[PDB]
mmCIF file of C-alpha atoms (C1' of nucleotides) and ligand atoms in Angstrom:
data_model
loop_
_atom_site.group_PDB
_atom_site.id
_atom_site.type_symbol
_atom_site.label_atom_id
_atom_site.label_comp_id
_atom_site.label_asym_id
_atom_site.label_seq_id
_atom_site.Cartn_x
_atom_site.Cartn_y
_atom_site.Cartn_z
ATOM 1 C CA UNK C 1 31.076 5.116 -2.937
ATOM 2 C CA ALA C 2 29.158 7.131 -5.874
ATOM 3 C CA UNK C 3 26.506 10.532 -4.303
ATOM 4 C CA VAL C 4 23.858 10.143 -6.759
ATOM 5 C CA UNK C 5 21.398 10.785 -2.603
ATOM 6 C CA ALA C 6 23.971 9.001 -0.232
ATOM 7 C CA UNK C 7 28.279 9.712 -0.882
ATOM 8 C CA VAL C 8 29.649 6.687 0.714
ATOM 9 C CA UNK V 1 17.762 11.255 -9.907
ATOM 10 C CA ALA V 2 15.680 12.895 -12.598
ATOM 11 C CA UNK V 3 15.893 16.531 -13.452
ATOM 12 C CA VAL V 4 12.275 17.624 -14.150
ATOM 13 C CA UNK V 5 11.981 20.809 -10.692
ATOM 14 C CA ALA V 6 14.126 19.360 -8.494
ATOM 15 C CA UNK V 7 17.648 17.308 -10.348
ATOM 16 C CA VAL V 8 18.198 14.905 -7.457
ATOM 17 C "C1'" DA E 1 29.233 1.229 4.394
ATOM 18 C "C1'" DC E 2 23.233 4.832 1.169
ATOM 19 C "C1'" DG E 3 19.864 8.425 1.249
ATOM 20 C "C1'" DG E 4 17.635 11.690 -1.430
ATOM 21 C "C1'" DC E 5 12.913 16.745 -4.712
ATOM 22 C "C1'" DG E 6 11.573 21.358 -6.558
ATOM 23 C "C1'" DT E 7 9.556 24.191 -9.737
ATOM 24 C "C1'" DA Y 1 5.973 16.668 -14.886
ATOM 25 C "C1'" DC Y 2 10.086 11.741 -12.125
ATOM 26 C "C1'" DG Y 3 14.507 8.853 -11.438
ATOM 27 C "C1'" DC Y 4 19.480 6.748 -10.411
ATOM 28 C "C1'" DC Y 5 24.733 3.984 -7.576
ATOM 29 C "C1'" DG Y 6 29.829 2.754 -7.605
ATOM 30 C "C1'" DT Y 7 34.049 2.702 -5.013
HETATM 31 C C1 QUI H 101 30.384 3.099 -3.586
HETATM 32 O O1 QUI H 101 31.050 2.840 -4.071
HETATM 33 C C2 QUI H 101 29.012 1.900 -2.358
HETATM 34 C C3 QUI H 101 29.320 0.339 -2.829
HETATM 35 N N1 QUI H 101 28.411 -0.034 -2.529
HETATM 36 C C4 QUI H 101 27.436 0.632 -1.065
HETATM 37 C C5 QUI H 101 26.469 -0.482 -0.377
HETATM 38 C C6 QUI H 101 25.939 0.138 0.765
HETATM 39 C C7 QUI H 101 25.865 0.958 1.261
HETATM 40 C C8 QUI H 101 27.563 1.902 0.559
HETATM 41 C C9 QUI H 101 28.337 1.155 -0.472
HETATM 42 N N2 QUI H 101 28.590 2.253 -1.616
HETATM 43 C C1 QUI H 102 20.656 8.262 -2.706
HETATM 44 O O1 QUI H 102 19.276 8.700 -2.106
HETATM 45 C C2 QUI H 102 19.881 7.138 -3.580
HETATM 46 C C3 QUI H 102 18.671 6.608 -2.812
HETATM 47 N N1 QUI H 102 18.066 5.099 -3.305
HETATM 48 C C4 QUI H 102 18.867 4.996 -4.973
HETATM 49 C C5 QUI H 102 19.061 3.783 -5.477
HETATM 50 C C6 QUI H 102 19.547 3.537 -7.056
HETATM 51 C C7 QUI H 102 20.763 4.204 -6.988
HETATM 52 C C8 QUI H 102 21.199 5.660 -6.622
HETATM 53 C C9 QUI H 102 20.508 5.737 -5.671
HETATM 54 N N2 QUI H 102 20.543 6.987 -4.390
HETATM 55 C C1 QUI H 103 15.772 10.142 -9.039
HETATM 56 O O1 QUI H 103 15.742 9.601 -9.240
HETATM 57 C C2 QUI H 103 15.445 10.439 -7.363
HETATM 58 C C3 QUI H 103 13.802 9.107 -6.946
HETATM 59 N N1 QUI H 103 13.778 9.259 -6.219
HETATM 60 C C4 QUI H 103 13.672 10.277 -5.373
HETATM 61 C C5 QUI H 103 12.808 10.119 -3.870
HETATM 62 C C6 QUI H 103 12.856 11.304 -2.943
HETATM 63 C C7 QUI H 103 13.692 12.743 -3.122
HETATM 64 C C8 QUI H 103 15.084 12.702 -5.511
HETATM 65 C C9 QUI H 103 14.274 11.575 -5.373
HETATM 66 N N2 QUI H 103 15.386 10.984 -6.819
HETATM 67 C C1 QUI H 104 9.947 18.964 -9.667
HETATM 68 O O1 QUI H 104 10.062 20.674 -9.097
HETATM 69 C C2 QUI H 104 8.733 18.810 -10.102
HETATM 70 C C3 QUI H 104 7.597 18.323 -8.567
HETATM 71 N N1 QUI H 104 7.280 17.113 -8.548
HETATM 72 C C4 QUI H 104 7.567 16.923 -9.343
HETATM 73 C C5 QUI H 104 5.945 15.350 -9.211
HETATM 74 C C6 QUI H 104 6.282 14.437 -10.058
HETATM 75 C C7 QUI H 104 7.113 14.703 -11.341
HETATM 76 C C8 QUI H 104 8.156 15.838 -11.599
HETATM 77 C C9 QUI H 104 7.799 16.879 -10.745
HETATM 78 N N2 QUI H 104 8.109 17.965 -10.761
HETATM 79 MN MN1 MN H 105 17.530 2.577 0.212
HETATM 80 MN MN1 MN H 106 7.252 18.078 -3.345
HETATM 81 MN MN1 MN H 107 26.171 -1.464 -6.510
#
DNA sequence: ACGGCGT
DNA sequence: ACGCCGT
């Protein structure tokens, strides 16, 4: 759920 | 995650 | 269920 | 010269 590199 | 030049 | 960078 | 995540 976090998007810091993927944003799932 | 660090932004020293890119800031991802 | 997910992965990324440039000055 | 630089490292981080939650629904
Ligand atoms: C988002 O909150 C989140 C939390 N845990 C994960 C585990 C694996 C893939 C993606 C995830 N996203
Ligand atoms: C994004 O691509 C990504 C990859 N690895 C991580 C590890 C810990 C927190 C955030 C991250 N983001
Ligand atoms: C941020 O903490 C971070 C860590 N590792 C990376 C590797 C590749 C591109 C971006 C990154 N960001
Ligand atoms: C920013 O553009 C950038 C490029 N290369 C690096 C290498 C090591 C630490 C920080 C960096 N920042
Ligand atoms: Mn990964
Ligand atoms: Mn580079
Ligand atoms: Mn977590």
